[PDB]
Amino acid sequence: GCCSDPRCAWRC
């Protein structure tokens, strides 16, 4: 939804 992505772990 927000980030939820390979680059994001605890980000959005």
Q: What does 1-12 look like in DSSP terms, one character per residue?
A: --S-STT-SS--
Q: 10 exposed, middle or buried (CB, 10 Å; 0-12, 13-18, 19+)? A: exposed
CB contact at 8 A, 1 and 11? no
The SS3 of residue 10 is: coil
∠ at Cα 4 (10, 11), nearest 5°?
A: 25
CA 12 to chain centre: 5
Q: Which amino acid is residue 9, in one-letter code?
A: A
CB atoms within 10 A of CB 8: 10
Q: What is the distance between the alpha carbons of residues 12 and 6, in angstroms, rounded to a whole number? A: 12
Experimental method for this entry? NMR
CA 9 to chain centre: 6
Would you say how long the chain is, in residues? 12
